[PDB]
DNA sequence: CGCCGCGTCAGACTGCACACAATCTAAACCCTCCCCTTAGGGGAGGGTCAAGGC
RNA sequence: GCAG
DNA sequence: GCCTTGACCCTCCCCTAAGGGGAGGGTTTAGATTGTGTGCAGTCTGACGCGGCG
């Protein structure tokens, strides 16, 4: 997978209501990984790593 | 030698008995001269001395002085071998505790102090203290301190309380409390209070403490003081040839615990700072923890590669560890392996074994000879004899082989028909070549497949493989009862060949004396093979006494005919050969000679078909050429034609009368009649095509092209292939499913261009894939089956119970999947089933249904049948033979001693890798007829039925009922109840839409609290040109009626209450949210109007059918028979009452609103009627409709799955994992019994204590039967060594060591474990021996 | 590979589920018969005796 | 010689049974000196012990009255 | 066939006597699990 | 040079060559791999890579 | 008491071939104990060889 | 890396 | 034939005089330095259970 961001979804296979939910990703050559995404109520967080 | 296997903690003193000597230093071996060092973790003075009979110094050598201690280094004078067995000891400074009950969940350590994991764990690791007994101050047990709290409440309260950190306080408060005073105390706090999960802990941790005191166990013995040391020769220290080492990984972990214990002896005996002595002893924690169990607390240790290292618990856990690797199965001498090819000119109980491989696997075997014959003096002479290959060694070898059966075995053994005996036939090449009948059932081609062949040593071994896997026992399938060494591809296409008829074929119409005259011509050249003739054919009926008796008759046959029959054994008819032979001709052939004249005659005649289907394969010729792929002449005018209509699909797109939806659909739809019309055409012209002469006139026929000879004979491919040879090929798919609109419109015969091959890889690699990836999800899911069903053997001959299913003919709908005969084959009745005139027992109670009473049941109309069933048997450990029915590879009643569960869970997930990953129309005659029959008459005179369970079958003139339908409640039925109809008359009519409340009884409308406004919004429409309302939803209302509901109740005209028949209780409609109202109050309505209206697979279906997983919505069921009413509304989870008539009322519900309920206030139901609807949870149908209804629901949902795909799998073999489904029971009761309520037992457990309680006129303990996955109910068995052999070793282990469990070895697993027989089959009487010699 | 003459038809069972039946002629000719090399190596160690 | 066992497993009317029998005389043929009862044709002691249990001179009860006999004869060799 | 080790060479010994009859053991694999599960601070044991 | 060394013998990438014949040479210097370090893994690669 | 987060637990079977891991640091004192250096001596432990008598 |  | 009997004879272990050579173990090192960093992996999904937590 090429370094650069990458928006993606699970087109709603989590808390069976179908809702789809989506993520970004910042993946870089060398160095740690920074995602951001929202959660069922619609809340963005963010994972490093 | 030994009868059981106990488990158990392992006291300090325990652990210093076992050991040889206490391991001081980490010293594996010296350098120089690579002796083991004294005290180290090799020692020979330890673990015993490194040489055989001799002293590590040499002082002794012989085994003159044996046993005896060198006193200049104490190793004794020995063999080496034992140190695979003398372990050694660790003493640790400070203690440990034992990971295994620290962290396996649930905690031990804290489930016995009631303390939680993580404060545990901030004692363990030197965060907090805990106060191990307060005395007279306000700090109970095991409160824990911070740092700073423990200092000021120093000197507070002195010294009096005791309060420490580390695993010296847990072990403290494990050995400062008293386990029965603590379980007492558990008792009458459990006595007290009713809340669920509350009782629930506490009956988990009573159980844990009376299994602390049953055992021997001490709960401080949980945190190691004494550590083991392995035995250094299953951690050995080895030198490689390139002068290297190589090691185990234990040498590192002990290394390291020893190493990081005599550095906390070395700072106890400096008096470091407690910081430092700390930090030692979190290390010496963790180092255990990495040995015992590496990676489960935290991060893996990783030396020297950056990979972790493998410790205690990885040895003997996992697809790698000592359960899977090395004792369930192992590398086997005597055996050996090569590439398969064909041989057949073979019989069918022998296979082609290379020489120079059989002079290999008989060895011994071969020097015993050469001794015994004098050929050899000694033998190393042998030796000599056989590796110079002498030429009488091969006439000894010809001698040693001559009765002596060999296993050939292919993997994956996927049933029990994978490894089979074959009495050898010494080759020439180094291929072995199998006999082809037997491949289908090796499921081997000879591509490159290869197969593994064993020795079977013994005597008893080369009569098992005489005896029960001989190839020419095994001509049944042991899952359906179909023939599995049965003719295909060559064969199948010579015998449909030969058995065929040509119009003007050579010496056509010619009267012959017998099949030998056929014979003769058509050697000869003087008649074709089919040439239509009349041939005297002489055969054989079998009479009611049993021989035969002749009969001779012209018979109209072909010369193929008349040749075939020279091979079809006596007593079978002549109009089995009288047709032209496909494969299922071929497949019930076999099967009629093996039902009528048993297995040896089969034998004879499958190889004789055999042959003779191989060599008029050959005399044929039947070739495939490019002209065999016949396109129809219409296929490019269909296309074209297909093209203007998509064209004109796609132009009127342009003219926006057509959504890309359905515009997208529709060329969907007039490519796919494309696609038949042209698949019809090219089938057409191909199956007839064939147009010749009789006398002049021309006449059309059967065709004999190649290509469809070979689809119609079942030999090789189907309509489906040659429709891509010869048609087109098709509609495909995208890689996400959704088909691509425009199709391969060109087939093999011609070019697929760049693109359209292109599309089809797209599909072509979905299907590659697919099949890789799903053969690990079909052998896990046989996995799980075997180790849920191993233990499962027919132990009894009659169990003498009356119960069993009601076998029926399952009927989808308008069509019989599955008929009554086939269901009912081979079992045992469990009634006596009569004639529908009643009181004539036309078959009676306990027989078995082989196929002559199959037939008289099919000459009477019976349609349902009362059998005995495996989940109905009476039999505690075992099932009776009676029970489970018919075996299916012999065809007679089951032996005692069969082991059912592995066939059953073989012969459920063999077939594993085939899987993947309105109104009513009566179809043909009959008598209508209703269940739940609970009916109205509507104003047009229609009946509408008052019910929700009620079903529309039909029975037939016979009795039979031919299909069935099932009717939404209040559906208006054109046809009334017990009446006539033809093909097509719609009966029942609704709309899905929508749901219609139904009209009680016929009367005027008023509202009960249907407050104008509080309840509803009126709506105005001009379409129909009525004013109408609308109930109002949860979200869109006032403070109110929200609460009160709105509710329509039926007034005369007069102003009386009208009542419902039978009842005088106020009938009305309570009507919820969402629903149409459009009649107004004071119409006149009649019984049977609407008065408002509310609108609206494959391997993992029986992975997560086998493993009771409950379904993501589930439908809700009615618990006890009641009425319904309603609680607390719009809360987000409504509350739902049951009111029985004659039972406690009360009987609450959570049921979330977000879900329609399907069902009304008013009307009573019953146990087992759902309320809501959706996908039924089989916890919720054993628990409410039975154990039967769970067991028909399971085989039901399975054989749904396993009948798409064409597989024929017998019922018995889901019934039998069911049976191993429903084996615990929950105390509900205690009775006069041991068992607590609320506990799980084992259900035969409940069975025989109820059975001795009642004997003795006590009462005995009330149970509900539980339904566990077959996961949870491998781990649950009673044996810890099976269930710590299918996975969770870790958590069976610990669980059976607190509890102190002791594992009978009654099992198959457990007996394959320790290398004993098995119980089942040969070794059934040993075990049965065994029982009758030791209990007395 | 080499330019072999193929009839297609069943063959007395000698070419059932894939099996190739093969002439003499293709074994007299050498026509697959392909010369494989081995290297095996003697190594001459210093051991402690 | 042997192609299938069916017909013995009428007599000992099990498999399991009929392996049993037929390896306890198959030993007692093979070590020991007790010759076949039926003629033995090259076959090897587990195919004639099948083909004694196929005429039915050979069962479970008749080797256990020939065990209580012999063994009666020649541990009532008291001298 | 595979662990017995006093089982195999009187299983041979056997084959090359004339006969065919073995002296089953212990797996040794067996005795390998269970020292090393008694190396796990749990004892497992053989009750006679 | 350890860095480089292990590289180029131990990678999983770094494979011993396909030499049959001249098609299976120039057909393994022109293959692509998901797997490697920084890439997937055959088990937990899904359907859709 | 119902829910969300987190941890744990699984994930086909035989076969060939190949082949591990690769970085990573003190010196100057002293001591004891063992084996070695010549050209054979000394002796315990254990066989062997012609002779003789029974 | 591959074979079924 | 059955024995003895003195004379030989072999191997092997240790010893010589005055240290040499090495292995394998101890011990102190006095300007002053006072928190690990891989340019890591993190990338597997689904089921289940349990525990904080509102
Ligand atoms: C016994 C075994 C045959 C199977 C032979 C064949 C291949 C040999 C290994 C490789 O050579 C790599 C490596 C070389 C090192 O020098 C010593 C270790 C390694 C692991 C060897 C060990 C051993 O010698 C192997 C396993
Ligand atoms: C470790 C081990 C196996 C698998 Sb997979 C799998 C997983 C995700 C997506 C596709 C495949 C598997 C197989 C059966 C049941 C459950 C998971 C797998 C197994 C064998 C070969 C290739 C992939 C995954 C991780
Ligand atoms: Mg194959
Ligand atoms: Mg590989
Ligand atoms: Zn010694
Ligand atoms: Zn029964």
């Given at each position: 997978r090429s370094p650069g961001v990458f928006f993606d979804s699970?087109?709603?296979?989590?808390?069976?209501?179908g809702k789809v939910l989506y993520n970004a990703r910042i993946i870089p050559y060398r160095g740690s990984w920074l995602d951001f995404e929202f959660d069922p109520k619609d809340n963005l967080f963010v994972r490093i790593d | 030698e030994f009868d059981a296997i106990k488990i158990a903690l392992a006291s300090p003193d325990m652990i210093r008995s076992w050991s040889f000597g206490e391991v001081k230093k980490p010293e594996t071996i010296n350098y120089r001269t690579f002796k083991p060092e004294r005290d180290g973790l090799f020692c020979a003075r330890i673990f015993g001395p490194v040489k055989d009979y001799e002293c590590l110094c040499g002082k002794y050598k012989r085994?003159?002085?044996?046993?005896?201690?060198?006193?200049?280094?104490?190793?004794?004078?020995?063999?080496?071998?034992v140190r695979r067995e003398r372990m050694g000891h660790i003493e640790l400074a400070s203690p440990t505790a034992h990971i295994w009950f620290l962290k396996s969940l649930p905690s031990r350590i804290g489930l016995l102090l009631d303390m939680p994991l993580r404060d545990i764990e901030r004692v363990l690791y030197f965060e907090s203290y805990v106060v191990i007994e307060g005395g007279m101050t306000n700090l109970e047990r095991q409160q824990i301190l911070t740092e700073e709290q423990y200092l000021d409440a120093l000197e507070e309260f002195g010294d009096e309380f005791d309060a420490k950190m580390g695993a010296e306080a847990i072990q403290a408060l494990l050995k400062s409390m008293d386990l029965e005073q603590e379980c007492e105390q558990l008792r009458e706090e459990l006595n007290e209070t009713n809340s669920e999960t509350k009782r629930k802990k506490l009956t988990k941790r009573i159980k844990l403490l009376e299994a602390f005191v049953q055992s021997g166990n001490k709960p401080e013995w949980m945190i190691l003081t004494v550590l083991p040391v392995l035995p250094p020769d299953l951690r050995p220290l080895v030198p490689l040839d390139g002068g290297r080492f190589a090691t185990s990984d234990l040498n590192d972990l002990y290394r390291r615990v020893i190493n990081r214990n005599n550095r906390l002896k070395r700072l106890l005996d400096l008096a470091a700072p407690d910081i430092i002595v700390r930090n030692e002893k979190r290390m010496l924690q963790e180092a255990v923890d990495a040995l015992l169990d590496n990676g489960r607390r935290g991060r893996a240790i990783t030396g020297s590669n950056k990979r972790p290292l493998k410790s205690l618990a990885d040895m003997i856990k996992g697809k790698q560890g000592r359960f899977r690797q090395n004792l369930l199965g192992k590398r086997v001498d005597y055996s050996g392996r090569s590439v398969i090819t064909v041989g057949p000119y073979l019989r069918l109980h022998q296979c082609g074994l290379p020489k120079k491989m059989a002079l290999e696997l008989f060895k011994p075997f071969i020097y015993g000879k050469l001794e015994l014959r004098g050929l050899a003096t000694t033998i190393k002479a042998a030796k000599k004899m056989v590796e110079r290959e002498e030429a009488v060694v091969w006439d000894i070898l010809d001698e040693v082989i001559r009765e002596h059966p060999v296993l050939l075995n292919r993997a994956p053994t996927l049933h029990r028909l994978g490894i089979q005996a074959f009495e050898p036939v010494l080759i020439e090449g180094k291929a072995i070549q199998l006999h082809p009948l037997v491949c289908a059932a090796y499921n081997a081609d000879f591509d490159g497949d290869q197969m593994a062949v064993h020795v079977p040593l013994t005597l008893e071994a080369q009569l098992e493989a005489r005896a029960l896997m001989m190839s020419t026992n095994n001509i049944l399938s042991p899952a359906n009862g179909e023939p599995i060494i049965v003719p295909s591809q060559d064969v199948v296409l010579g015998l449909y060949y030969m058995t065929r008829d040509c119009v003007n074929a050579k010496g056509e119409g010619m009267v012959l004396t017998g099949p030998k005259e056929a014979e003769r011509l058509y050697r000869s050249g003087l008649a074709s093979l089919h040439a239509r003739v009349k041939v005297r054919i002489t055969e054989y009926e079998k009479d009611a006494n049993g021989e035969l008796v002749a009969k001779t008759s012209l018979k109209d046959t072909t010369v193929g005919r008349a040749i075939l029959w020279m091979i079809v054994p006596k007593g079978l008819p002549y109009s089995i050969v009288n047709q032209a032979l496909g494969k299922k001709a071929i497949s019930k052939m076999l099967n009629t000679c093996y039902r009528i004249l048993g297995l040896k005659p089969t034998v004879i005649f499958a190889d004789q078909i055999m042959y003779t289907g191989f060599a008029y394969a050959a005399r044929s010729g039947a070739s495939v050429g490019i002209d065999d792929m016949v396109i129809p002449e219409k296929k490019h005018e269909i296309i074209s034609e297909a093209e203007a209509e998509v064209a004109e699909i796609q132009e009127q797109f342009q003219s926006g009368l057509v959504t890309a939806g359905e515009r997208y659909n529709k060329v969907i739809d007039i490519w796919a009649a494309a696609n038949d019309r042209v698949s019809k055409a090219m089938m057409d012209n191909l199956q007839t095509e064939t147009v010749i002469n009789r006398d002049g006139q021309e006449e059309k026929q059967v065709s004999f092209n190649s290509i469809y000879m070979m689809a119609d004979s079942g030999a090789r491919g189907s309509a489906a292939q040659i429709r891509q040879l010869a048609g087109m090929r098709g509609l495909m798919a995208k890689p996400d499913g959704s088909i691509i609109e425009t199709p391969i419109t060109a087939n093999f015969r011609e070019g697929l261009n760049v693109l359209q091959y292109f599309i089809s890889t797209h599909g072509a690699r979905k299907g590659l894939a697919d099949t890789a990836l799903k053969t690990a999800n079909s052998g896990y899911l046989t996995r799980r089956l075997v180790d849920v069903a191993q233990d499962l053997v027919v132990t009894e001959d009659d169990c003498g119970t009356h119960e069993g299913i009601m076998m029926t003919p399952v009927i989808e709908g308008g069509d019989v999947k599955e008929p009554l005969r086939d269901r009912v084959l081979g079992r045992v009745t469990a009634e006596d089933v009569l004639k529908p005139g009643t009181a004539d027992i036309l078959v009676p109670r306990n027989t078995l249904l082989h196929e002559q009473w199959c037939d008289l049941l099919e000459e009477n109309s019976v349609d349902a049948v009362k059998v005995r069933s495996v989940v109905s048997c009476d039999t505690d450990f075992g099932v009776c033979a009676h029970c489970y029915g018919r075996d299916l590879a012999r065809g007679h009643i089951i032996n005692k001693g069969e082991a059912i569960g592995v066939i059953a869970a073989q012969s459920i997930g063999?077939?594993?890798?085939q899987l993947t990953m309105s109104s009513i129309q009566v179809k043909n005659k009959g008598s209508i007829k209703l269940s739940n029959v609970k009916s109205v008459v509507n104003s047009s005179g229609k009946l509408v039925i008052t019910s929700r369970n009620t079903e529309l079958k039909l029975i037939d003139e016979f009795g039979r009922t031919k299909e069935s339908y099932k009717v939404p409640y209040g559906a208006v039925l054109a046809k009334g109840d017990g009446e006539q109809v033809a093909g097509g008359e719609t009966v029942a009519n609704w709309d899905p839409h929508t749901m219609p409340v139904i009209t009680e009884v016929s009367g005027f409308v008023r509202f009960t609290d249907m407050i104008d406004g509080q309840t509803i919004t009126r709506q105005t429409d001009e379409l129909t040109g009525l004013s109408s309302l609308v109930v109002l939803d949860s979200?869109?209302?006032?403070?109110?009626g929200k609460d009160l509901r709105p509710a329509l109740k039926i007034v005369d005209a007069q102003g009386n209450d009208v009542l419902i028949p039978g009842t005088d209780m106020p009938a009305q409609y309570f009507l919820p949210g969402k629903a149409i109202v459009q009649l107004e109050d004071g119409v006149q309505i009649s019984s049977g109007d609407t008065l408002a209206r509310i609108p609206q697979g494959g391997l993992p279906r029986v992975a997560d059918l086998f493993e009771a997983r409950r379904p993501k919505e589930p439908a809700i069921l009615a618990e006890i028979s009641g009425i319904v009413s309603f609680g607390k509304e719009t809360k987000g989870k409504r509350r739902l009452v049951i009111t029985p008539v004659d039972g406690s009322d009360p009987y609450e519900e959570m049921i979330p609103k977000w879900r329609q309920l399907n069902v009304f206030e008013g009307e009573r139901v019953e146990r087992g009627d759902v309320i809501s609807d959706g996908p039924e949870a089989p916890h919720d149908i054993l628990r409410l409709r039975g154990v039967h209804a769970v067991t028909r629901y399971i085989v039901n949902e399975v054989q749904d799955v396993y009948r798409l795909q064409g597989v024929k799998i017998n019922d018995k073999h889901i019934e039998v994992i069911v049976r191993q489904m429903l084996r615990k029971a929950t105390i509900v009761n205690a009775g006069s019994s041991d068992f607590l309520e609320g506990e799980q037992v084992e259900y035969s457990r409940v069975k025989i204590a109820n059975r001795e309680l009642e004997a003795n006129g006590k009462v005995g303990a009330t149970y509900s039967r539980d339904l566990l996955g077959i996961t949870k109910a491998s781990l649950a068995t009673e044996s810890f060594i099976s269930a710590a052999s299918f996975q969770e070793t870790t958590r069976v282990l610990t669980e059976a060591a607190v509890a102190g469990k002791r594992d009978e070895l009654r099992g198959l697993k457990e007996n394959v474990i320790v290398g004993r027989l098995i119980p089942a089959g040969t070794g059934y009487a040993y075990h049965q021996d065994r029982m009758r010699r030791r209990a007395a | 590979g080499q330019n072999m003459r193929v009839a297609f038809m069943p063959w007395n069972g000698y070419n059932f589920e894939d099996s190739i039946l093969v002439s003499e002629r293709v074994v007299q000719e050498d026509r697959f018969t392909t010369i494989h090399i081995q290297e095996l190596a003697c190594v001459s160690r210093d051991t402690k005796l | 010689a042997r192609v299938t066992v069916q017909d013995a497993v009428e007599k000992i009317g099990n498999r399991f049974d009929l392996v049993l029998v037929a390896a306890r005389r198959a030993r007692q043929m093979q070590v020991g000196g007790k010759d076949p009862l039926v003629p033995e044709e090259n076959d090897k002691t587990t195919v004639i012990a099948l083909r004694e249990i196929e005429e039915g001179l050979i069962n479970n009860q008749i080797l256990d009255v020939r065990e209580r006999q012999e063994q009666q004869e020649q541990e009532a060799a008291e001298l | 066939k595979s662990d017995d080790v006093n089982g195999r060479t009187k299983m041979y010994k056997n084959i090359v006597d004339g006969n065919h009859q073995m002296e089953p053991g212990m797996p040794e694999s067996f005795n390998v699990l269970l020292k090393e599960i008694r190396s796990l601070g749990i004892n497992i044991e053989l009750e006679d | 040079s350890a860095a480089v060394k292990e590289f180029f013998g131990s990678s999983q990438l770094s494979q011993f060559m396909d030499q049959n014949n001249p098609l299976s040479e120039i057909t393994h210097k022109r293959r692509i791999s998901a797997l490697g370090p920084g890439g997937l893994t055959r088990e937990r690669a899904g359907f859709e890579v």
């Open positions: 699970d087109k709603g296979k989590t808390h069976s209501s | 085994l003159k002085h044996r046993g005896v201690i060198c006193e200049k280094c104490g190793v004794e004078v020995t063999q080496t071998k063999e077939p594993g890798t979200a869109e209302r006032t403070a109110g | - | - | - | -």
